[PDB]
Amino acid sequence: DIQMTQTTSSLSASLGDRVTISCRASQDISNFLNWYQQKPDGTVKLLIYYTSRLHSGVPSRFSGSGSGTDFSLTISKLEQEDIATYFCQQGNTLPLTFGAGTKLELKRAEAAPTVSIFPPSSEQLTSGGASVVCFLNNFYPKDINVKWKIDGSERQNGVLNSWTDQDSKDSTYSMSSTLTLTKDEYERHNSYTCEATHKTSTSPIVKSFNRNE
């Protein structure tokens, strides 16, 4: 088949920047190359077809170039609504094939996470379970590390981490980390700590509680 490659999987830019997304084909596809936009609500729209033609109702800031095996989509002035994932697609030979997508994100100043720790709710404890939750909120850039201490010992089993997509309002990221324990295990230890390591400090941000002080 023809393999479409989008070597950059996520590209950061500032609003107003000229943004170009690369697409390469494993063999010559002439100009049978189309570009689609995908958004979180699941909506998929055609933007550019036949390498450079603008689909009806698509803003003129979108343009397309290329031939043979090397193609690009350019946004001449990035707007907030352009924050999305872009897919190229060849139509030269069956089976039709797509690139793996390029997600756009916004640049902003670095920000330390705001960290908050939450013991199991009394309701969860009555039910027989115990989850300890740590929010690492509104930080930038997106990479971050969380470490759980239980009475000093690092716990990675039972830990599940989830990241938000980039905040549409302040361009930050957030992450939730949940330590799940049986209630019996939770009541057999005393000190619960979650540590946030982020480029904004050489020191971890540490939040802690003692099960029931």
Binding site: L46, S116, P120, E123, S127, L160, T164, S174
Partner: protein, 220 residues
């Protein structure tokens, strides 16, 4: 005004089959092919196949031969795709999309149909309030949480104060654990706002027809 209306979300057991629909409108249905496309977040976008509505001639991506069967009811401008022998690898969003021929673009897409293939049983969530440690906050703002544990399938909807509290909210993508889903959300307000004002986490789980409205109360 071309519109492609797809059927709703499906949860099926491994080994079963599912048939999904796409009803076209706003154009002469038999002048265009109908296509189906799979979106998974392990294999991105894949073309499954196409179908000629006048005679029902089909062309498949060989990767989907056996997996997918395309049919049409041209009288109702409806295209069907049956997916068989289902596995977790088939869990994905499936799109219908038209083109006039395969050298031309998918110029209109349906809204997508989400398929979940799993042995897990439909289960309503437990919703636990996350109040600050009884010794918080120590500053100008305070952060509250909501922990939505043990539900199936996706999705849930979560709002704060029925959506009136929308600033300062982070709702995290659900993750599988004990293969049930768990999701959390946080909200941050000024310390002068809580606990003096009521803050409620509102969770709805359509699949189990359940709604929970959990007030966040100070810890005892």
């Amino acid at each position: 005004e071309v519109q492609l209306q797809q059927s709703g979300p499906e949860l099926v057991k491994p080994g079963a089959s599912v048939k999904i629909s796409c009803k076209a409108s706003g154009y002469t249905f038999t002048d265009y092919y109908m296509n189906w496309v799979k979106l998974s977040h392990g294999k991105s976008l894949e073309w499954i196949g196409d179908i000629v509505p006048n005679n029902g001639d089909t062309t498949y991506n060989q990767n989907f031969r056996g997996k997918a069967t395309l049919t049409v009811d041209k009288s109702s401008s409806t295209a069907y795709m049956e997916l068989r022998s289902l596995t977790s690898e088939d869990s994905a969003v499936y799109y219908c999309a038209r083109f006039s021929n395969y050298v031309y673009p998918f110029d209109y897409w349906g809204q997508g149909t989400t398929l979940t293939v799993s042995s897990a049983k439909t289960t309503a969530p437990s919703v636990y309030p996350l109040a600050p440690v009884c010794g918080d906050t120590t500053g100008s703002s305070v952060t509250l949480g909501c922990l939505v544990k043990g539900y199936f399938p996706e999705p849930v909807t979560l709002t704060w104060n029925s959506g009136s509290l929308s600033s300062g909210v982070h709702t995290f993508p659900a993750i599988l654990q004990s293969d049930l889903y768990t999701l959390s959300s946080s909200v941050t307000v000024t310390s002068s706002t809580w606990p003096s004002q009521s803050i409620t986490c509102n969770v709805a789980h359509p699949a189990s027809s359940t709604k929970v409205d959990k007030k966040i109360e100070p810890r005892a």
